mmCIF file of N, CA and C in Angstrom:
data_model
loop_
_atom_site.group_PDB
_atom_site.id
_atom_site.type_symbol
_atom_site.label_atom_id
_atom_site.label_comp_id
_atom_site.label_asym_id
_atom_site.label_seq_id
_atom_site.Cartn_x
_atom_site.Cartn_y
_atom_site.Cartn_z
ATOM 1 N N UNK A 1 -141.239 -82.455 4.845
ATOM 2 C CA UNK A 1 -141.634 -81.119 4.438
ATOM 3 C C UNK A 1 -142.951 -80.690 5.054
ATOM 4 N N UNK A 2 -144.003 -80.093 4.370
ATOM 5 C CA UNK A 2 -145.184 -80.137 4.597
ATOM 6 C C UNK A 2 -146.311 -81.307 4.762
ATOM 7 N N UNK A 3 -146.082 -81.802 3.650
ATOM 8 C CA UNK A 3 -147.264 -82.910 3.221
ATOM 9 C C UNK A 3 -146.596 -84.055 3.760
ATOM 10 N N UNK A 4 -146.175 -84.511 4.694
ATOM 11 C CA UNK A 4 -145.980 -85.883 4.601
ATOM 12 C C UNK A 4 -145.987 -86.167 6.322
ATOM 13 N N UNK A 5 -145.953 -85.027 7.008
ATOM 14 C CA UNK A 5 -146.021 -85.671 8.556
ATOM 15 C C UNK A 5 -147.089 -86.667 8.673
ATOM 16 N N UNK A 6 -146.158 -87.336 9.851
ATOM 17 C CA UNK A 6 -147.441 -88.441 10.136
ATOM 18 C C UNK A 6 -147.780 -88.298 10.942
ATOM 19 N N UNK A 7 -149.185 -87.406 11.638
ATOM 20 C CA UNK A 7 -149.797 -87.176 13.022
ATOM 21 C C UNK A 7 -151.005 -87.578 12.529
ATOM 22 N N UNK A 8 -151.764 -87.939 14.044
ATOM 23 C CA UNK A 8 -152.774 -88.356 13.985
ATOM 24 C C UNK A 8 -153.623 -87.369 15.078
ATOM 25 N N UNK A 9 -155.057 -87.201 14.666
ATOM 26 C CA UNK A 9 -155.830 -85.876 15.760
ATOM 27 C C UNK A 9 -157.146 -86.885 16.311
ATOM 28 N N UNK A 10 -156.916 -87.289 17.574
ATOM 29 C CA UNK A 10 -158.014 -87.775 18.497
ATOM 30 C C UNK A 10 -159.252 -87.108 19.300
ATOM 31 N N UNK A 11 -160.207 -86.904 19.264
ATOM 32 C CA UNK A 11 -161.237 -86.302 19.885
ATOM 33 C C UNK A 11 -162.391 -87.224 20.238
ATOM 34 N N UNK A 12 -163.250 -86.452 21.110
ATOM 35 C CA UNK A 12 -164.731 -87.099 21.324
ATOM 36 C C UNK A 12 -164.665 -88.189 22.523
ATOM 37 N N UNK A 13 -163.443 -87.784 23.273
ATOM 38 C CA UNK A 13 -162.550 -88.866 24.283
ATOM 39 C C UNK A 13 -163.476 -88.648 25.987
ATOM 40 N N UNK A 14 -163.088 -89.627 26.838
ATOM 41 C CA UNK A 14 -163.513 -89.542 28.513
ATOM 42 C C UNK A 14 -162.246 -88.164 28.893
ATOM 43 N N UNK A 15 -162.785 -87.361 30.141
ATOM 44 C CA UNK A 15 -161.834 -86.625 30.851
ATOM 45 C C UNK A 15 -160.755 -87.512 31.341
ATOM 46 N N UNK A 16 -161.564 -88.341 32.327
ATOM 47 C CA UNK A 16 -161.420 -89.651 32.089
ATOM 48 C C UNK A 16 -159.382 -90.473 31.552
ATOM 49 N N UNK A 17 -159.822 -90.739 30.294
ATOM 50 C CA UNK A 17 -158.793 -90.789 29.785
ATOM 51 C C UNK A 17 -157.661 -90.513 30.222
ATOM 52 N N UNK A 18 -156.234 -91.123 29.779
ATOM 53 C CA UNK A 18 -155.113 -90.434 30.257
ATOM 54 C C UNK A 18 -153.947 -90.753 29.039
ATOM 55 N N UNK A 19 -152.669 -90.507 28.624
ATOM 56 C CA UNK A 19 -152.086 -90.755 27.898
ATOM 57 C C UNK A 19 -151.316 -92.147 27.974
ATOM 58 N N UNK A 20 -151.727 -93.044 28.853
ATOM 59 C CA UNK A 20 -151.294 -94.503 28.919
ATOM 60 C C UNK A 20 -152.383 -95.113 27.782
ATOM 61 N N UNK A 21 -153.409 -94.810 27.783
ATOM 62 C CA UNK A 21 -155.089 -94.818 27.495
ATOM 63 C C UNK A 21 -154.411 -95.332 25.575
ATOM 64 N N UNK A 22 -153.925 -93.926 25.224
ATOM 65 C CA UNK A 22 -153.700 -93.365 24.138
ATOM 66 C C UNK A 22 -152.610 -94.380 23.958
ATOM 67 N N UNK A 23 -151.194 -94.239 24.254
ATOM 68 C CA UNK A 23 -150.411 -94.992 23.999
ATOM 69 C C UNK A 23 -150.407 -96.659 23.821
ATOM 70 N N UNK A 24 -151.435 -96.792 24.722
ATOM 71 C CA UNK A 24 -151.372 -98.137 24.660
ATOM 72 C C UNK A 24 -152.476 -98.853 24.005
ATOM 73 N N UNK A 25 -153.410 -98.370 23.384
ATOM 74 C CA UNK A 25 -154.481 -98.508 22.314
ATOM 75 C C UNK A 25 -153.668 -98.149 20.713
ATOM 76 N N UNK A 26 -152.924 -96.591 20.676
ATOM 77 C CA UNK A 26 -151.999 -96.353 19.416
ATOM 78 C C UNK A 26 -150.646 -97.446 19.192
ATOM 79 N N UNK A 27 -150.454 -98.307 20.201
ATOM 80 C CA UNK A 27 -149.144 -99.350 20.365
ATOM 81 C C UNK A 27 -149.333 -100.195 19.066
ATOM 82 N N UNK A 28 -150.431 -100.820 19.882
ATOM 83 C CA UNK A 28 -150.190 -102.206 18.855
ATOM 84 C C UNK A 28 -150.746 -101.366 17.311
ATOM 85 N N UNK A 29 -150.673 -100.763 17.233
ATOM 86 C CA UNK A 29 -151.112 -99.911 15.658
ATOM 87 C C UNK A 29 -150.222 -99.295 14.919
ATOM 88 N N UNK A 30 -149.022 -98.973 15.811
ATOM 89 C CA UNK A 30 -147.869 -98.203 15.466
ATOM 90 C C UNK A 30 -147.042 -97.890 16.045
ATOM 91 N N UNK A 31 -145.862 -97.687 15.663
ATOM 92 C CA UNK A 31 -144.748 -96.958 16.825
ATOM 93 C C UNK A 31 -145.027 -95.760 16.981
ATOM 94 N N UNK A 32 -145.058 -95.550 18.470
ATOM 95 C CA UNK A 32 -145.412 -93.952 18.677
ATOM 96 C C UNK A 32 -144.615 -92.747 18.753
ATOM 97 N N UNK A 33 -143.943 -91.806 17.996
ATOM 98 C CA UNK A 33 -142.984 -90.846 18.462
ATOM 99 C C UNK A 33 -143.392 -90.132 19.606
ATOM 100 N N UNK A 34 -144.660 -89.785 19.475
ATOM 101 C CA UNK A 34 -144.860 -89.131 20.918
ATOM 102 C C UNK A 34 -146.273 -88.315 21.098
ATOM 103 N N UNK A 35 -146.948 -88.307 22.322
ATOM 104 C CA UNK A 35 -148.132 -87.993 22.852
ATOM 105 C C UNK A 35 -148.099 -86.673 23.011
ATOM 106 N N UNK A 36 -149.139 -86.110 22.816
ATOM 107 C CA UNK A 36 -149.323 -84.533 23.803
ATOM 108 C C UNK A 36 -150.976 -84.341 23.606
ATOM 109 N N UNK A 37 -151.466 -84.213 25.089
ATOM 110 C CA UNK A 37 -152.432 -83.912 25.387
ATOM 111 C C UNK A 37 -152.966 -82.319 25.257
ATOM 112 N N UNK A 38 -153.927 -82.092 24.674
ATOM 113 C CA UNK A 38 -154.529 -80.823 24.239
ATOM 114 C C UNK A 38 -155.569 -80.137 25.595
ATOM 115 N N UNK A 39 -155.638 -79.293 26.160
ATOM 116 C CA UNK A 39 -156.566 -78.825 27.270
ATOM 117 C C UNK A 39 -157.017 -77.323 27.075
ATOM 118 N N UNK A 40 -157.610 -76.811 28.028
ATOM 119 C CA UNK A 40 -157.961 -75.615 28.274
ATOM 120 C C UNK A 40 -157.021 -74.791 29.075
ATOM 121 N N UNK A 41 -157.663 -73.563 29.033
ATOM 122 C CA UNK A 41 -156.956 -72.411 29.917
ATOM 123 C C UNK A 41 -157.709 -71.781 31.206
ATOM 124 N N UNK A 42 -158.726 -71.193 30.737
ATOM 125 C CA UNK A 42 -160.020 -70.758 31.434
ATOM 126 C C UNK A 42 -161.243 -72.034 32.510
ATOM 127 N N UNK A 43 -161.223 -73.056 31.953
ATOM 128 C CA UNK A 43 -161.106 -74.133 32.291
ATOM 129 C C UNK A 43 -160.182 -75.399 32.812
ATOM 130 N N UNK A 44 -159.333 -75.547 31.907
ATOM 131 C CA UNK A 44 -158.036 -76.680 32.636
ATOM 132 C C UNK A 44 -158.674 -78.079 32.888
ATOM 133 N N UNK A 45 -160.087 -78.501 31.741
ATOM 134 C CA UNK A 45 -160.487 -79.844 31.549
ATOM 135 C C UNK A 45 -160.577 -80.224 30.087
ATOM 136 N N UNK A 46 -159.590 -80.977 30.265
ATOM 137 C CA UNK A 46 -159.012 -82.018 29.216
ATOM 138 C C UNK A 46 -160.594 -82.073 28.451
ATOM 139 N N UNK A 47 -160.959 -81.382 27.376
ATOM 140 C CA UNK A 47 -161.749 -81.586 26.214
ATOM 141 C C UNK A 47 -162.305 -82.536 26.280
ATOM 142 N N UNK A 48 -161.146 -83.616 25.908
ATOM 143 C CA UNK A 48 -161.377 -85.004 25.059
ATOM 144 C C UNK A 48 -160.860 -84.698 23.988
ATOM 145 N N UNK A 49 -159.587 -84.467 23.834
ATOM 146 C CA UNK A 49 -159.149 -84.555 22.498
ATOM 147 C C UNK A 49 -157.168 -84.364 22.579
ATOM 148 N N UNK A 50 -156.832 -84.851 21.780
ATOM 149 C CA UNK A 50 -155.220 -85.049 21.601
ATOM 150 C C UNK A 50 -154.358 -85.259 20.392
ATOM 151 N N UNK A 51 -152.809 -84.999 20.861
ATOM 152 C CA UNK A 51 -152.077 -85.301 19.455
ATOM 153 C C UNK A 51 -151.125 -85.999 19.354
ATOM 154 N N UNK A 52 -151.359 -87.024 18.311
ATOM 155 C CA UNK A 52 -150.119 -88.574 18.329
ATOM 156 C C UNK A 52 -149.693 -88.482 17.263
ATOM 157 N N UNK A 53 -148.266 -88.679 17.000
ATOM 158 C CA UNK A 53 -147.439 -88.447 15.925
ATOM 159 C C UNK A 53 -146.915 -89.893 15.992
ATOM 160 N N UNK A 54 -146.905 -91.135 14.683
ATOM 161 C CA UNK A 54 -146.162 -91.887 14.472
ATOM 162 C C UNK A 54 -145.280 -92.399 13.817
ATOM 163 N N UNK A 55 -144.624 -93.459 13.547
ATOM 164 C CA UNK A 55 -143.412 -93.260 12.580
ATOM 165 C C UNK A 55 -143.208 -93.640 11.260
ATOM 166 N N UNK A 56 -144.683 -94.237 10.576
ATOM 167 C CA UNK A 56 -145.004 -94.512 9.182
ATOM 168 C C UNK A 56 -146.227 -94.279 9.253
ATOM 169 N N UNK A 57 -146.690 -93.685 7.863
ATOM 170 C CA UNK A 57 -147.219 -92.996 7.673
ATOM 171 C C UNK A 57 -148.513 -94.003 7.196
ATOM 172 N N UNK A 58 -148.156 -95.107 7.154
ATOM 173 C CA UNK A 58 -148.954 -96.023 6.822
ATOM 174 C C UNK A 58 -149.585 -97.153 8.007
ATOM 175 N N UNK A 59 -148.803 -96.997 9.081
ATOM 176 C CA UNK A 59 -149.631 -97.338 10.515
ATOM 177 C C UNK A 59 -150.294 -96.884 10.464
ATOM 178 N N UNK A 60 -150.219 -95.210 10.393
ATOM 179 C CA UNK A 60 -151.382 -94.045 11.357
ATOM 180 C C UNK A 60 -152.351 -94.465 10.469
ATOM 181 N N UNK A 61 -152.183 -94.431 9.540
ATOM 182 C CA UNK A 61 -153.634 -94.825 8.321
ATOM 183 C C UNK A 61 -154.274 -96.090 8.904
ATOM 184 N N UNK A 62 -153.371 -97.252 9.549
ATOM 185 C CA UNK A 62 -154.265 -98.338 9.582
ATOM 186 C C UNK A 62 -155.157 -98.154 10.920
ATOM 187 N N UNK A 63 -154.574 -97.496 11.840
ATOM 188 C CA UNK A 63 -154.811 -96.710 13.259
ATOM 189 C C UNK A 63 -156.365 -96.090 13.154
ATOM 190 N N UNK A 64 -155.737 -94.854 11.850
ATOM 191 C CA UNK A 64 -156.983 -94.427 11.707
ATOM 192 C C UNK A 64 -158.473 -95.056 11.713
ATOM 193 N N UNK A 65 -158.237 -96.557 10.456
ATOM 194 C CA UNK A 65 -159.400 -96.892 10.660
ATOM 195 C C UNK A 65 -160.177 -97.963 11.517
ATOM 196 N N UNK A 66 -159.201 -98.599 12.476
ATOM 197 C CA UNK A 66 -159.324 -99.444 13.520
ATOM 198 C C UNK A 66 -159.766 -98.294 14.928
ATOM 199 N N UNK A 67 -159.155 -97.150 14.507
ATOM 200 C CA UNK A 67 -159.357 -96.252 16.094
ATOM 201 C C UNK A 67 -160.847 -95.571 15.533
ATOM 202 N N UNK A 68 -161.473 -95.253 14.173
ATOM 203 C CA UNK A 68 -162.498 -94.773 14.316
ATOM 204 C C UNK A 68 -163.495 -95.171 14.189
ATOM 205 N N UNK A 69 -164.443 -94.907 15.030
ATOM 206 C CA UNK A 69 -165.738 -95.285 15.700
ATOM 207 C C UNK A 69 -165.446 -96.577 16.320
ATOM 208 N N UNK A 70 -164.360 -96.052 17.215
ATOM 209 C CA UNK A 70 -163.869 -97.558 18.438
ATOM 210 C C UNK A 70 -164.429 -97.015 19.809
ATOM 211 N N UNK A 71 -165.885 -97.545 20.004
ATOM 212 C CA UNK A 71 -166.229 -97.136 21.429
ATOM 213 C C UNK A 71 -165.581 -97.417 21.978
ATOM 214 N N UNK A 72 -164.763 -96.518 23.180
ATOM 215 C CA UNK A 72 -163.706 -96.690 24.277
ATOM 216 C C UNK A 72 -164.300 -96.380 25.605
ATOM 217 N N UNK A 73 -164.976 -95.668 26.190
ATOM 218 C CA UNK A 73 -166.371 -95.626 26.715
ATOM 219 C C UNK A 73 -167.966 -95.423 26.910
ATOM 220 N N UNK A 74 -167.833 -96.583 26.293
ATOM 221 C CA UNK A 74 -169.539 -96.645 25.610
ATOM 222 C C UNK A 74 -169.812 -96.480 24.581
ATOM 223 N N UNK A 75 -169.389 -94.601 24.147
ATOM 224 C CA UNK A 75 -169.775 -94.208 23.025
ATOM 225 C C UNK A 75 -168.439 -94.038 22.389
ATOM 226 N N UNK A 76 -168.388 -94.356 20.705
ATOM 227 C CA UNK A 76 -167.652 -94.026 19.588
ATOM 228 C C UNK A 76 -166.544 -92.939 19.727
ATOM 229 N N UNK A 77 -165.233 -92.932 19.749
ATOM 230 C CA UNK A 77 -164.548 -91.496 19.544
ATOM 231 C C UNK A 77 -164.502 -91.457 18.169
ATOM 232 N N UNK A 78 -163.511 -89.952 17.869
ATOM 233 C CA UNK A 78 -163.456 -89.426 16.758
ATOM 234 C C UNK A 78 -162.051 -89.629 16.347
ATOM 235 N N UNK A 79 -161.568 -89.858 14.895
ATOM 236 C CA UNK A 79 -160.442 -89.839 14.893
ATOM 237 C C UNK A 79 -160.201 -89.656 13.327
ATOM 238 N N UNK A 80 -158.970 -88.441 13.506
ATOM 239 C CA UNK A 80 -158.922 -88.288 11.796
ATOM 240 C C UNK A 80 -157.547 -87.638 11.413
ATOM 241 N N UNK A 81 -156.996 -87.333 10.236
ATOM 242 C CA UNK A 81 -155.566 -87.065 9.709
ATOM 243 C C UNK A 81 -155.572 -85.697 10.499
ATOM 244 N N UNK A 82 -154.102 -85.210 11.012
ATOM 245 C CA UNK A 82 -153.782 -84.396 11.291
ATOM 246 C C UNK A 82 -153.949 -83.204 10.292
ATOM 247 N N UNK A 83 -153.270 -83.695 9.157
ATOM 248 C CA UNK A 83 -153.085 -83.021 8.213
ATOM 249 C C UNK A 83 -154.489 -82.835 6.635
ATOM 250 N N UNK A 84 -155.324 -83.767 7.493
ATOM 251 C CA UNK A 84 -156.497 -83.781 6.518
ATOM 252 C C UNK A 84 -156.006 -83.562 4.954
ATOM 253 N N UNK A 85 -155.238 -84.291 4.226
ATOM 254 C CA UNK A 85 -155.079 -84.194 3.627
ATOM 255 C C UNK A 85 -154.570 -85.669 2.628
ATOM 256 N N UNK A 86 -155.349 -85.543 1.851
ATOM 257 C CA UNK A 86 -155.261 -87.155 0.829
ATOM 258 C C UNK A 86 -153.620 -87.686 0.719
ATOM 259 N N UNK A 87 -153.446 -88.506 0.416
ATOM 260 C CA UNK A 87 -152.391 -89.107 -0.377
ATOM 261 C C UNK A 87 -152.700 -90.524 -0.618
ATOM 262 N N UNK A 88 -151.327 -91.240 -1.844
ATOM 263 C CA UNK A 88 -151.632 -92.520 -1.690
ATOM 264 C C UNK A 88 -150.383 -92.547 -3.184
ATOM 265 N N UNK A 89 -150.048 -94.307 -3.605
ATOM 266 C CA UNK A 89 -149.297 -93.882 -4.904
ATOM 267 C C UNK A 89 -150.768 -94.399 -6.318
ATOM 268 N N UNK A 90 -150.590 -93.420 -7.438
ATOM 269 C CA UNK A 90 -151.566 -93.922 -8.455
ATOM 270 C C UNK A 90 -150.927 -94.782 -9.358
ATOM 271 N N UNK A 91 -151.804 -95.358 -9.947
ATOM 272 C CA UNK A 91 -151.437 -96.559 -10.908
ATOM 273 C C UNK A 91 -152.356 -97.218 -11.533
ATOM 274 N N UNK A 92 -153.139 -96.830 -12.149
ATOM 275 C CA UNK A 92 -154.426 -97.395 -12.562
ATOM 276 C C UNK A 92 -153.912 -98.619 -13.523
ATOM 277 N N UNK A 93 -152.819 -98.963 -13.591
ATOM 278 C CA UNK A 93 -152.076 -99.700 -14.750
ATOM 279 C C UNK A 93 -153.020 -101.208 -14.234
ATOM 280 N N UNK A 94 -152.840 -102.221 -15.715
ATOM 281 C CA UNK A 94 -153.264 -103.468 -15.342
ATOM 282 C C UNK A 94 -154.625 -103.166 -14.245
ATOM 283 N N UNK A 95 -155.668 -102.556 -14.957
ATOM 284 C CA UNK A 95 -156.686 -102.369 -14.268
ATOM 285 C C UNK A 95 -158.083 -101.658 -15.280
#
């Protein structure tokens, strides 16, 4: 529906970079449905930033926090929910 895609939003990246870069750093973290690189118009240089969609929703989470603040050149990228938006199951039971 709404709330439950599993994408992931990369920024703060090298031009540098390429989508092997991405795929093969997001691999061992998750199965990847698929890459797409984000750019300009007026320009036509790759930001540093992109969009990875994977296939549980609970990789991208572990992704998330292994991919952020993972210097990839030199300095730290950015990396955070597509959908910025919480989830999880509650249960405060036996606690």
């Amino acid at each position: 529906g709404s709330s439950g895609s599993s994408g992931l939003y990369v920024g703060s990246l090298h031009f540098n970079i390429t989508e092997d870069m991405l795929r093969g750093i997001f691999e061992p973290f998750g199965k990847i449905d698929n890459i797409v690189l984000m750019k300009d118009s007026d320009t036509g240089r790759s930001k540093g930033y992109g969009f990875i969609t994977f296939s549980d929703s609970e990789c991208a989470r572990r992704a998330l926090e292994q991919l952020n603040g993972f210097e990839l050149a030199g300095r730290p990228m950015r990396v955070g929910h597509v959908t910025e938006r919480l989830d999880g199951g509650s249960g405060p039971s036996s606690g």
